[PDB]
Design a protein around this ligand. Structure first.
Ligand SMILES: C[C@@H]1NC(=O)[C@H](NC(=N)N)CCCCNC(=O)[C@H](CCCCN)NC(=O)[C@H](CCCCN)NC(=O)Cc2cccc(c2)CNC1=O
Lengths: 153, 38
């Protein structure tokens, strides 16, 4: 199954079937966050997906081809996290991103908290394009979570 | 062994739940890919 769309990343080296993350299939390339697979090969039905490009510092990895997703947050508009939590249906959550200010520039961030196995869920703009992946972030004073909108090049 | 299974189309939902604020945070990204608050 290479059909475009959002996919769960599952493993069974644990109790039952565990969802370790989420990813995006687009143009024959599977996109997810590095900490989800740590660069390991993946099975899709009868076929195998082998890693193609990865970068621990970006926390990204692609399978079967180079990174294809190149939309970016416009800065001004709200976005939607298409959260795919473990054992639960895909659900769109709309939000106005905050901002990670870094030495190298500014990155959109979303203040949404989901189980760890939601890592890799896509964030989308209003035209439906994937502007990044959810799951690499920080924990603020409150004790809850703000994820970067992590996009590749 | 890890395996993938489809969970849906990638589409904007007009009837979406809205939540979350929009904080501005000074962060650092280290060589391990971990953000930290500055
Ligand atoms: C399951 C549950 N919830 C959460 O884990 C998080 N929600 C929250 N914590 N409110 C949401 C997670 C969303 C998916 N993303 C990750 O799993 C990544 C994987 C690391 C990739 C880093 N390259 N982790 C992170 O992004 C941050 C990075 C912090 C870097 C600071 N230097 N780590 C944590 O939150 C771990 C943690 C801290 C405090 C308290 C707890 C867990 C206790 N809660 C939990 O266990």
């Amino acid at each position: 199954e290479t059909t475009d769309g959002v996919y769960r990343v599952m493993t069974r080296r644990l109790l039952g079937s565990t969802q370790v993350g989420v990813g995006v299939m687009q143009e024959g390339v599977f996109h997810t966050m590095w900490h989800v697979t740590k660069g390991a090969a993946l099975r899709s039905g009868e076929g195998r997906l082998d890693p193609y490009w990865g970068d621990v510092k970006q926390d990204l990895v692609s399978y079967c081809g180079p990174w294809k997703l190149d939309a970016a947050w416009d800065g001004l508009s709200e976005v939607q996290l298409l959260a795919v939590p473990p054992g639960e249906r895909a659900k769109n959550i709309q939000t106005l991103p905050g901002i990670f200010k870094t030495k190298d520039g500014d990155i959109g961030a979303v203040a949404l908290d989901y189980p760890a196995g939601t890592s890799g869920s896509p964030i989308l703009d209003k035209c439906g394009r994937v502007i990044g992946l959810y799951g690499n972030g920080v924990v603020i004073k409150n004790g809850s979570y703000v994820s970067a909108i992590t996009q590749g090049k | 062994d890890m395996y993938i299974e489809r969970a849906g189309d990638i589409t904007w939902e007009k009837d979406a739940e809205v939540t979350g604020n929009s904080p501005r945070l000074d962060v650092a990204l280290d060589e391990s890919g971990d953000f930290s608050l500055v």
